[PDB]
Ligand binder design. Structure first.
Ligand SMILES: *[C@@H]1O[C@H](CO)[C@@H](O[C@@H]2O[C@H](CO)[C@@H](O)[C@H](O)[C@H]2NC(C)=O)[C@H](O)[C@H]1NC(C)=O
Ligand SMILES: *[C@@H]1O[C@H](CO)[C@@H](O[C@@H]2O[C@H](CO)[C@@H](O)[C@H](O)[C@H]2NC(C)=O)[C@H](O)[C@H]1NC(C)=O
Ligand SMILES: *[C@@H]1O[C@H](CO)[C@@H](O[C@@H]2O[C@H](CO)[C@@H](O)[C@H](O)[C@H]2NC(C)=O)[C@H](O)[C@H]1NC(C)=O
Ligand SMILES: *[C@@H]1O[C@H](CO)[C@@H](O[C@@H]2O[C@H](CO)[C@@H](O)[C@H](O)[C@H]2NC(C)=O)[C@H](O)[C@H]1NC(C)=O
Ligand SMILES: *[C@@H]1O[C@H](CO)[C@@H](O)[C@H](O)[C@H]1NC(C)=O
Ligand SMILES: *[C@@H]1O[C@H](CO)[C@@H](O)[C@H](O)[C@H]1NC(C)=O
Ligand SMILES: *[C@@H]1O[C@H](CO)[C@@H](O)[C@H](O)[C@H]1NC(C)=O
Ligand SMILES: *[C@@H]1O[C@H](CO)[C@@H](O)[C@H](O)[C@H]1NC(C)=O
Ligand SMILES: *[C@@H]1O[C@H](CO)[C@@H](O)[C@H](O)[C@H]1NC(C)=O
Ligand SMILES: *[C@@H]1O[C@H](CO)[C@@H](O)[C@H](O)[C@H]1NC(C)=O
Ligand SMILES: *[C@@H]1O[C@H](CO)[C@@H](O)[C@H](O)[C@H]1NC(C)=O
Lengths: 408, 136, 99, 99, 50
């Protein structure tokens, strides 16, 4: 309707999650061990194919180096290493579920601990798995530094020197950022703290009950395992020769006759390596796009407040906290959701003494008998004085203008 | 069962056999192998190098050095502070200080190498950053 | 010879229903329904909010409501004609089919 | 010049368009009907080349599943189907070309 | 067959990049007002219709 508006009278603090892969397994390959083995006759026929193998080693090595740059680009956002204060009091807010606990030897938060107990679910033929440069303990130190900097400083440590500020004032700043005045937070400080604490508690049970929560991190673990198993099982395929064993056909066959049999096995096993390497190159490109996005969310939702809609969680963004998972990262988005709306009647302008009046920051509203001006996100009526309106015009052109009294 | 001969794993590779002379079951494990890396500074600066044996124990390498390894390009020997064992492999040719600097040449799980000042190649633990604490 | 094409899960009628829902929610509510519950607001006030967003005071819109409405209607009529004339306008979508 | 400025005294409203592909055609391929067809002798020869076709089936099925996910993420944003009022007066604006 | 399948895999990755961009333009230009320059049209953005 063209004279009816609805305005909320209450809010709600909600916490969600977000899971993103950041890196995958690093691998290396060896041609002669995989293709020929210890047979010297085979290795002499292989060198006639040129520099196929040098290309394969270059491709896998390039991927391995890129994985280490993916992790360094997401977590190594801080030059310093900040530490949490000894006394954990933040004006009613509880952070015990995200800060590290010294009792555990690895110093991991309770939420970070159960993540490692879910997604966690020698050599064969020269295929080796290389270890990541940054250990799990080193990664958690970066996460702890980010958490301890966004609690005692806010967003100031992401642009220069870190400046301390009491936590409620930071929340008041963020309320101003989303568009609600300061007095809302201070007059409801106790209620808001209780709402946030309840939201944190549900996170642990949400991941416990839901089986398919860490499904995106689980896929990369299984996909890399399937490719290696498929590659190894290709060593027992005839490909068109008498047998699948190099020295078995070496003995019971004519030396020139055996030459063409080795040719079939070599060509078949070269084609298997090409399929594997090409598959990894495409997957590595897909992971890199995911790692680039996680680096942007870390810089824009954690080290600051973002006004991009639906980028750092559904609702109006307030802050965020990072948590580390194997081969990935988890975000905890804290947002602001309105509730308990109500009918109202509105007008575009107020006419008084032949002059029009428009609100400064607010929308005119009427409860049936009296006209008030209120902010457009929380019902808080005020009297229509001249300190919250500007005249700027005449009472003749605006359509739908009503007339009332303005108290100077 | 008293009619089978040899066992196979999931990927169809032999891992157990039975002796035909006396009926007894034996296990089969492949002989060790892995990659080899060379850590060097600028050849415009020095000629010393450090060798990394990827994914192998230090005792296995030392035992096999007695004329049983397929790479005659061996280092000098275990001259005290040369054999340092990391989670990536048996690093030979570098001395492990207990200080911490920023990484210069990546090696493995948190270990880096650099040419510091006599002159020698040293291996340390990567330093995350300068510590700080905000008075809240 | 062994080649098949599978139909998409969402029919072309179902997709058009989603687009209708977005248009109806962005006309009667604005940006409110993207965060929480949809909230009523007359359309001209939404345009005043958007002028405030771009940096122009409210009274500019109210004193020029007829002029802006005529400009908006005319600017959308030309969209059809520009589509009839140029046949290579939908090059990107046609490129996918041919490839 | 360091003591001169230019300030607009009027405005205009313009409408532009942008075209973006979302999904493509889903296909499935069978080896035996393609490589051999119905010849049993060819099937046996193809049998002892390992598991090549098992990889081809899995590669093409993963692409087909993504095609439905792309359209789901673009359009299925809101979970409430809104409806426009029967009367279509919006302060002089005319949405008849898109409703 | 392998040549055909490999080409399709590369094409699909290109489509995801376009689909992700389209999903972003719907969240920021349609369900809100964007202050990013030349993201939702040339000029000062007001609204959008899909
Ligand atoms: C806004 O909503 C909150 C959430 O329900 C209300 O808080 C409840 O208020 C009732 C009555 O005052 C209490 O019995 C509940 O215990 C409160 N809940 C919590 C979690 O504290 C609040 O009263 C609402 N405010 C208004 C003005 O209606
Ligand atoms: C922050 O929340 C935690 C989790 O609820 C609180 O720890 C609980 O404290 C109660 C009261 O002593 C115990 O009954 C629970 O067993 C504790 N839970 C855990 C997991 O330790 C903690 O007390 C809260 N912080 C403050 C300052 O009260
Ligand atoms: C601002 O521009 C608008 C159009 O862009 C002007 O309106 C035009 O005025 C002329 C003269 O009266 C008419 O012939 C046109 O038909 C009008 N345009 C439309 C779309 O109706 C307006 O006059 C300009 N304002 C100023 C102060 O120059
Ligand atoms: C909104 O625009 C449409 C499109 O021009 C208007 O429909 C046209 O109205 C004229 C005048 O009656 C007819 O000559 C045309 O044939 C109509 N178009 C079509 C496609 O039939 C419509 O009237 C406008 N809305 C209002 C409320 O006037
Ligand atoms: C717009 O307001 C007028 C009164 O000025 C009223 O007659 C009309 O019904 C309103 N529009 C709608 C859609 O209700
Ligand atoms: C606002 O008015 C409409 C019109 O009947 C009504 O359906 C709706 O429930 C009202 N809103 C509230 C919060 O009561
Ligand atoms: C509407 O506001 C006036 C102004 O205070 C008040 O006197 C009146 O009781 C209000 N009406 C209702 C129904 O609350
Ligand atoms: C005040 O508004 C009423 C109706 O909205 C109108 O009849 C009256 O003329 C207005 N006052 C003046 C002085 O014009
Ligand atoms: C074969 O000879 C050895 C000689 O010691 C004997 O121990 C073994 O039992 C013989 N094999 C069988 C099957 O008896
Ligand atoms: C290496 O060998 C030593 C002695 O044989 C042993 O104590 C150590 O556990 C071995 N390392 C590994 C990783 O098995
Ligand atoms: C280096 O210092 C640490 C801490 O004091 C000590 O534990 C370690 O033994 C030292 N390394 C030596 C003495 O080689």
């Amino acid at each position: 309707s063209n004279n009816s508006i609805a305005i909320p009278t209450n809010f709600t603090i909600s916490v969600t999650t977000e899971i993103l892969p950041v890196s995958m397994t690093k691998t290396s390959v060896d041609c002669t061990m995989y293709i020929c083995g210890d047979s010297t006759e085979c290795s002499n026929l292989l060198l006639q194919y040129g520099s196929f193998c040098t290309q394969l080693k270059r491709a896998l090595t390039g991927i391995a180096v890129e994985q280490d740059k993916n992790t360094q680009e997401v977590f190594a956002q801080v030059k310093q290493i900040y530490k949490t204060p000894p006394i954990k009091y933040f004006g009613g807010f509880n952070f015990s579920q995200i800060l590290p606990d010294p009792s555990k030897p690895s110093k991991r938060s309770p939420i970070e601990d159960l993540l490692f107990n879910k997604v966690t679910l020698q050599k064969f033929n020269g295929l080796t798995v290389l270890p990541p440069l940054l250990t799990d303990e080193m990664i958690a130190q970066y996460t702890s530094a980010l958490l301890a900097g966004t609690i005692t400083s806010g967003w100031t440590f992401g642009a220069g020197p870190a400046l301390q500020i009491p936590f409620p004032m930071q929340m008041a700043y963020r309320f101003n950022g989303i568009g609600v005045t300061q007095n809302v937070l201070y007059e409801n400080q106790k209620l808001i703290a209780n709402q946030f604490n309840s939201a944190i508690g549900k996170i642990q049970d949400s991941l416990f009950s839901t089986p398919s929560a860490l499904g995106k991190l689980q896929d990369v673990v299984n996909h890399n395992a399937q490719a290696l198993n498929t590659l190894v099982k290709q060593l027992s395929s005839k490909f068109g020769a008498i047998s699948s064993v190099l020295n078995d056909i070496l003995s019971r066959l004519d030396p020139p006759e055996a030459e063409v049999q080795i040719d079939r096995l070599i060509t078949g096993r070269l084609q298997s390596l090409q399929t594997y390497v090409t598959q990894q190159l495409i997957r590595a490109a897909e992971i890199r796009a995911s790692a680039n996005l996680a680096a942007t969310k870390m810089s824009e939702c954690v080290l600051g407040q973002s006004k991009r809609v639906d980028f750092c969680g559904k609702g109006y963004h307030l802050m965020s906290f990072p948590q580390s998972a194997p081969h990935g990262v988890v975000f905890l988005h804290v947002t602001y959701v309105p509730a308990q709306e109500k009918n109202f009647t509105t007008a575009p302008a107020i006419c008084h003494d032949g002059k029009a009046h428009f609100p400064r920051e607010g929308v005119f509203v009427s409860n049936g008998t009296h006209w008030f001006v209120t902010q457009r996100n929380f019902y808080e009526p005020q009297i229509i004085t001249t300190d919250n309106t500007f005249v700027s015009g005449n009472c003749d052109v605006v359509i739908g203008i009503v007339n009332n009294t303005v108290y100077d | 069962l008293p009619f089978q001969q040899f066992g196979r794993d999931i990927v169809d590779t032999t891992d157990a056999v039975r002796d035909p002379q006396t009926l007894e079951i034996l296990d089969i494990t492949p002989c060790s192998f892995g990659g080899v890396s060379v850590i060097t500074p600028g050849t415009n600066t020095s000629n010393q190098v450090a060798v990394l044996y990827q994914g192998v124990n230090c005792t296995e390498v030392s035992v096999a050095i007695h004329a049983d390894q397929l790479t005659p390009t061996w280092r000098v020997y275990s001259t005290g502070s040369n054999v340092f064992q990391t989670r990536a492999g048996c690093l030979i040719g570098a001395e492990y200080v207990n200080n911490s600097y920023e990484c210069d040449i990546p090696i493995g799980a948190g270990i880096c190498a650099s040419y510091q000042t006599s002159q020698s190649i040293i291996a340390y633990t990567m330093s995350l950053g300068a510590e700080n604490s905000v008075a809240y």
